[PDB]
Amino acid sequence: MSSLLNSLLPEYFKPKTNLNINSSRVQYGFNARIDMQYEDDSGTRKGSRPNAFMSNTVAFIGNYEGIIVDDIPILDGLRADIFDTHGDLDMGLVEDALSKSTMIRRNVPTYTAYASELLYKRNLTSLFYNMLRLYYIKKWGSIKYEKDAIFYDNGHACLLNRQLFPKSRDASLESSLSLPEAEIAMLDPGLEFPEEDVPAILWHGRVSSRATCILGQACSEFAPLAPFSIAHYSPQLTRKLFVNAPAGIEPSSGRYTHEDVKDAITILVSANQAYTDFEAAYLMLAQTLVSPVPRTAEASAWFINAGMVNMPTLSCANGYYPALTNVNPYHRLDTWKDTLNHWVAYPDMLFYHSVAMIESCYVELGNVARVSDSDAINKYTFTELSVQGRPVMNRGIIVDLTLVAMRTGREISLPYPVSCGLTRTDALLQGTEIHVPVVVKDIDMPQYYNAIDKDVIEGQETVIKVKQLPPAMYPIYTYGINTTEFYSDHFEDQVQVEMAPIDNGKAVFNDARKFSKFMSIMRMMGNDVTATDLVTGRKVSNWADNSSGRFLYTDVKYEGQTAFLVDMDTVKARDHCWVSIVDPNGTMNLSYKMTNFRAAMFSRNKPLYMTGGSVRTIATGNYRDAAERLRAMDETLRLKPFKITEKLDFRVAAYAIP
Amino acid sequence: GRFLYTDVKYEGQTAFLVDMDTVKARDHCWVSIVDPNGTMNLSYKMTNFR
């Protein structure tokens, strides 16, 4: 769904057609200008940060596994006459439709019996999913995965790719997969009984020598060596695949270019009228394509256990009964060919749509994790209250699109309630502390991180405990579309806090909200302050994340209640503007303004520049030549948003109906 | 049988950690706090005097 994911990008940013990705890691952000103004009891001070880079990091590494499941049928592309006055498939009219379009009327009773059983299981989403993955393996087939490389690196702790991904070796993306080929047989017209558990698809003219090899490899098993996002393990779709081609198919060549895969997809969709089936596969890949690099070491807990990708079962009966597919197809929405027309024009735009989607999900799960398990809307019952359709199960895409609705605060709508794709909320839905394996870089590691072994040596491999899941990403593209108090991602804001009395060289902050505001100010001024949690006896630091220049309360790494002892004597000066002061006095007022946003992308510690021309808009209106909006709002999936209502605690988040 | 704030025997900053799984029943004619969850609300009423 192009028009949906295209809306998530910020109004100032309009990306160009091509993007030459040449690495397994891409930073994306913006260069903003901050105009700070400070006032306290001592006096006033005015400064200005001329260039500030706020960015996340996203990679092409994510452990996933495929399962074949049975899902709903997509009834789009079938002729409009077989459907009655309502949006329902009548078997009374299928008998009539097949009868009028043949001379041999002996086969009508047999044809109707088989058609009735097959039409209620038609889904080509799994075939297009694999065909799309083959396109990007050939295009970006020079990305290197080194086993003894770094995953996260702060200075105290470190995670290697040996950990998080065991049973892996060093390989390029083209060298990862060695796909076998399934038998692409020809369906001779005259066969009366459709062979069971084998799909048949239509084709335009002669099946090319290259087109055979693509369809053969798309249906086969995926068995990777290196952990890659677009080369994840998938079960075998089918053994055989019939093709009702008037001209006979040619034998498989063995080799194909990425350009040849586009020609295979464009023909397969046009012949079968499977435009809505492609839209499902497009959204399903947008989830998987890229995975987040964690903000802090604790945010690696999300990516330990392998998330399951629900691939629908491959079934189709267009090859057997080509009478059912004619020139007047049935569609629910009039904008039902937009997603394919967008991809075929601008293939590399999927990267930006993928980054936009996975950001929105992992940002909002930062809030859902902090919700107490004694309210109406909680981690267990947030999807069920949101959805207003009838899917098979609240899994895959339904979970992800619910989180996008909660982020943007708008009603998202799909034509069919499809439940296919990655489920992320697995690490969240379990009342157990997660054991992230880490490497010790400095001797003073146990003071900061909640480590098992309290005495360590540089080189030792230990384990750290994570109870509450912290935010994996900060808002960048979705910055200021709706501002929560937790992130505090405002354009303009006036922070007011009262400074605690400095007894010896230490200031006690008993309250939780005041402590968050204090360290948030001192960070924007650019003062590396270090405080001691009195309950646990572990040191917290506002400079936890360098990439995103902000302080979240989850950097304390202790759910519950505590009091902090801030060290006011050892306040280091890392980055100093003219605003920056060391000695606060009385009531601290900081008023900042953010202006002059401009998007910038970094890859392999150099600037990554966009190539090609400017993207012209392709989009169809609500009506072509349709008079009355026959609402048909019974079967269509609808996802209602939730607004965060702030309360006194500040540690707990709460959702309400707007 | 009351607690005045001068029983702390020190004037400083206020950060009192109370662990509510080490509460022990001492006297007779007592209400039990076995395992609390959520917001607590304590209250009393003195009615007659002799």
C-alpha–C-alpha distance, residues A98 and A115, integer Å? 10
The residue of chain B with its CA nearest to that of A510 is B15
CB-nearest partner of B15 from A374, A503, A508: A508
| DSSP label at residue A313 | P
C-alpha–C-alpha distance, residues A507 and A569, integer Å? 10
Amino acid, res. A652:
V
- Give the residue from A177, A220, A233, A218 showing the smallest Cα distance to A62: A233
Query: Residues of B with CB below 8 A from A375's CB?
Result: none
DSSP H or E segment with residue A280: helix A275-288
| Residue A331 structure tokens | 């569609």
C-alpha–C-alpha distance, residues A506 and B17, integer Å? 20
What are the E-state strand segments in A263-401?
291-292, 307-312
Contact, A509 vs A563, CB < 8 A? yes
Please say whether the dihedral angle defined by the alpha carbons of residues A350, A355, A356 and A358, taken in this order, is positive or negative: positive
Other beta carbons within 10 Å of A305: 12
Query: Residues of B with CB below 8 A from A535's CB?
Result: 17
C-alpha–C-alpha distance, residues A536 and A92, integer Å? 72
The residue of chain B with its CA nearest to that of A372 is B38
CB-nearest partner of B17 from A503, A508, A535: A535
Q: In what order do the strands lie in the sheet with A64-69?
A: A64-69, A307-312, A421-422
Phi, psi (deg, nearest 5) at residue A403 = -75, -30
**Tokens 């709002």, residue located:** A633
Please count the CA atoms within 13 angstroms of the CA of A28 that sit on its side-chain side: 25
C-alpha–C-alpha distance, residues A475 and A82, integer Å? 48
Other beta carbons within 10 Å of B50: 2
**Tokens 């909200």, residue located:** A513
Other beta carbons within 10 Å of A250: 14
Q: Taking each helix axis as running N to C, give the angle between helix A108-118 and helix A91-100, from 0 to 180 degrees, rounded to the nearest 10.
A: 130
Please say whether the dihedral angle defined by the alpha carbons of residues A341, A347, A353 and A354, taken in this order, is positive or negative: positive
C-alpha–C-alpha distance, residues A376 and A641, integer Å? 15
Contact, A521 vs A45, CB < 8 A? no
In degrees, to the nearest 5, what angle opens at C-alpha A92 toward C-alphas A89 and A97?
85
Whether chain A has a CB inside 8 Å of the CB on B15: the answer is yes
Residues closing a segment before a gap in chain B (C–N exceeding 2.5 Å)? none
Q: Is A150 exposed, middle or buried (0-12, 13-18, 19+ CB in 10 A)?
A: exposed
Whether chain A has a CB inside 8 Å of the CB on B38: the answer is yes
Contact, A316 vs A487, CB < 8 A? no
In degrees, to the nearest 5, what angle opens at C-alpha A391 toward C-alphas A379 and A360?
45
Phi, psi (deg, nearest 5) at residue A53 = -100, 105
Query: Residues of A with CB below 8 A from B37's CB?
Result: 374
H-type alpha helices, A52-195 = 91-100, 108-118, 125-139, 173-176
C-alpha–C-alpha distance, residues A124 and A199, integer Å? 10
Contact, A541 vs A530, CB < 8 A? yes
- Give the residue from A43, A20, A21, A28 showing the smallest Cα distance to A477: A28
Whether chain A has a CB inside 8 Å of the CB on B16: the answer is no
CA A532 to chain centre: 37
Query: Residues of B with CB below 8 A from A510's CB?
Result: 13-15
Contact, A656 vs A642, CB < 8 A? yes
Query: Residues of A with CB below 8 A from B14's CB?
Result: 510
Query: Residues of B with CB below 8 A from A503's CB?
Result: 13
| Residue A253 structure tokens | 């060549």
**Tokens 């047999």, residue located:** A110
Left (φ > 0), alpha (ψ -120 to 50) or beta: where does A194 sit?
beta
**Tokens 């329902």, residue located:** A88
| Residue A607 structure tokens | 């600037």
| DSSP label at residue A230 | G
> In Å, how far are A297, A449, A455, A462, A551 from A446, measured between CA atoms?
13, 5, 7, 10, 22
Number of residues assigned to chain A? 658
> In Å, how far are A11, A62, A269, A278, A623 from A1, measured between CA atoms?
19, 23, 16, 9, 18
Amino acid, res. A494:
Q
Contact, A330 vs A74, CB < 8 A? no
Number of residues assigned to chain B? 50
DSSP B6-46: GGG---S-------TTS----SSS----SS--S--------
Check CB contact under 8 Å for B13 and A534: no
Task: Mark which residues 521-540 of A lie under 8 Å from B by CB.
Answer: 534-535
Whether chain A has a CB inside 8 Å of the CB on B14: the answer is yes
| DSSP label at residue A451 | B
Q: Is A600 exposed, middle or buried (0-12, 13-18, 19+ CB in 10 A)?
A: middle
Nearest-CA distance from A510 to chain B in Å?
6
SS3 A212: helix
- Give the residue from A363, A608, A393, A564 showing the smallest Cα distance to A477: A363
Other beta carbons within 10 Å of A73: 16
Give the residue from B10, B11, B13 with the most A CB atoms within 10 Å of its CB, the best one to mutate: B13
Beta-bridge partners for A310: A67, A421
H-type alpha helices, A32-180 = 91-100, 108-118, 125-139, 173-176
Contact, A310 vs A378, CB < 8 A? no
H-type alpha helices, A107-237 = 108-118, 125-139, 173-176, 209-219
